[PDB]
Scaffold this active site. Structure first.
Site, mmCIF file in Angstrom:
data_model
loop_
_atom_site.group_PDB
_atom_site.id
_atom_site.type_symbol
_atom_site.label_atom_id
_atom_site.label_comp_id
_atom_site.label_asym_id
_atom_site.label_seq_id
_atom_site.Cartn_x
_atom_site.Cartn_y
_atom_site.Cartn_z
ATOM 1 N N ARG A 183 -8.744 -9.585 2.347
ATOM 2 C CA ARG A 183 -7.935 -8.943 3.391
ATOM 3 C C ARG A 183 -8.212 -7.417 3.486
ATOM 4 N NH1 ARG A 183 -2.730 -6.517 3.447
ATOM 5 N NH2 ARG A 183 -1.407 -6.895 5.260
ATOM 6 N N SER A 189 4.086 -5.934 3.900
ATOM 7 C CA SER A 189 2.657 -6.053 4.291
ATOM 8 C C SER A 189 1.888 -6.827 3.218
ATOM 9 C CB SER A 189 2.040 -4.664 4.596
ATOM 10 O OG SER A 189 0.665 -4.795 4.965
ATOM 11 N N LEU A 190 1.114 -6.134 2.387
ATOM 12 C CA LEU A 190 0.561 -6.745 1.158
ATOM 13 C C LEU A 190 1.610 -7.489 0.297
ATOM 14 C CD1 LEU A 190 0.123 -6.117 -2.224
ATOM 15 C CD2 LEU A 190 -1.636 -7.314 -0.978
ATOM 16 N N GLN A 233 0.838 -1.213 0.000
ATOM 17 C CA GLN A 233 0.000 0.000 0.000
ATOM 18 C C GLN A 233 0.875 1.266 0.000
ATOM 19 O OE1 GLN A 233 -3.653 -0.332 0.289
ATOM 20 N NE2 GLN A 233 -3.684 1.895 -0.299
ATOM 21 N N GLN A 258 0.754 -11.122 11.190
ATOM 22 C CA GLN A 258 1.165 -9.967 10.417
ATOM 23 C C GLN A 258 0.146 -8.815 10.521
ATOM 24 O OE1 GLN A 258 0.313 -9.032 6.594
ATOM 25 N NE2 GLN A 258 2.373 -9.187 5.688
ATOM 26 N N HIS A 318 -1.817 -3.368 11.039
ATOM 27 C CA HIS A 318 -0.691 -3.676 11.943
ATOM 28 C C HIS A 318 -0.794 -3.026 13.342
ATOM 29 C CE1 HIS A 318 0.746 -5.448 8.264
ATOM 30 N NE2 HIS A 318 0.764 -4.261 7.677
#
Length: 314
Positions: A119, A94-95, A13, A252, A203
């Site tokens: 997600r 992340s992604l 992102q 995560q 997160h």
């Protein structure tokens, strides 16, 4: 085949842009076909959205996620097809971690795309309009940001959400708690701290239930043995087997991205070269600050791509 000093990293992102991969796609028909395949799993036409807009939907995370996963896998397939060297390790931010798993053969692109669309939706629903915020804090010490977050919380949630490089931490949580944290850091002199455009508090503990939803979504899919190991964000370590890899993905979501740790783990394992495999050059910039000896190159444009192939093909 596999080059032991080479790693691929996958952006997440923040890295999307209207027209991303436009110029590479003009040279390589596979790019749009990769987006069409991702589009089937995601249930949106990711190519049309990312080239033509509306940018407002592109920037919304349930769309940014599958578009960025499609983008990262498009560059991966191009690099692989053109006989670039195979990286010994993968990681993604992340992604990007899901992109790394699609590249390692763990999930089909179709499943990966379906999965990150979900997600995104689970994360958006965990914090409706104005509930969450995220803020980049530049130039302070980990210890001080961590102690400041504890001081600002009260009854609300504010925590480090990305450890991105020395002097770059993202904090996030409840909007009022994030604001109190920034005021406290400002009082202490820090002052280089900006609220990010995407408000979803990834997160942090506000994603805890969304992570249980994610875990159940995962458990309906086929997971395969990875062909290249993936250094995961929760703890900057490779995990063995389906259950452990899915568990590290559930964790995560609500715990901080250890990006500095992932990059340091790669360097420890003999990696001296890193290709940022997808749009932008965010991860490359972070890598430059974590460890200035690493040779980090983005691949998202015709000139960057060609520059990296010339330097690293086998």
């Amino acid at each position: 085949m596999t080059e032991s000093t080479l790693a691929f990293v996958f952006p997440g992102q923040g890295s999307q842009s209207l027209g991303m991969l436009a110029e590479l796609s003009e040279l390589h028909p596979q790019i749009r076909e990769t987006f069409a395949e991702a589009s089937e799993g995601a249930g949106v036409d990711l190519w049309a959205l990312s080239q033509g807009g509306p940018e407002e939907m592109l920037n919304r995370t349930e769309y940014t996620q599958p578009a960025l996963l499609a983008a990262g896998v498009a560059v991966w397939r191009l690099w692989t097809a053109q006989r670039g060297q195979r990286p010994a390790l993968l990681a993604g931010h992340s992604l990007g971690e899901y992109t790394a798993l699609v590249a390692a053969g763990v999930l089909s692109l179709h499943d990966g795309a379906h999965l990150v669309r979900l997600r995104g939706q689970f994360m958006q629903a965990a914090a409706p309009a104005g509930v969450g915020a995220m803020a980049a804090v530049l130039g302070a010490e980990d210890a001080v940001v961590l102690e400041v977050c504890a001081e600002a919380a009260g009854s609300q949630v504010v925590v480090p959400a990305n450890f991105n490089s020395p002097g770059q931490i993202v904090i996030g949580g409840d909007a009022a708690a994030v604001d109190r944290a920034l005021a406290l850091l400002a009082e202490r002199g820090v002052r280089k701290a900006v609220k990010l455009a995407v408000s979803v508090p990834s997160h942090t503990p506000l994603m805890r239930d969304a992570a249980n939803q994610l875990g159940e979504a995962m458990a309906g899919l086929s997971w395969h043995a990875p062909q290249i190991p993936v250094v995961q964000n929760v703890d900057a370590r490779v995990h063995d087997g389906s259950a452990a890899i899915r568990q590290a993905l559930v964790e995560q979501l609500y715990l901080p991205v250890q990006w500095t740790g992932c990059v340091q783990a790669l360097a420890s394992q003999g990696i001296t070269r890193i290709a940022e495999c997808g749009p932008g050059k965010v991860l490359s910039g972070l890598i430059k600050r974590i460890d200035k000896s690493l040779d980090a190159r983005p691949l998202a444009t015709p000139a960057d791509y060609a520059g990296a192939l010339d330097a690293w093909a086998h």
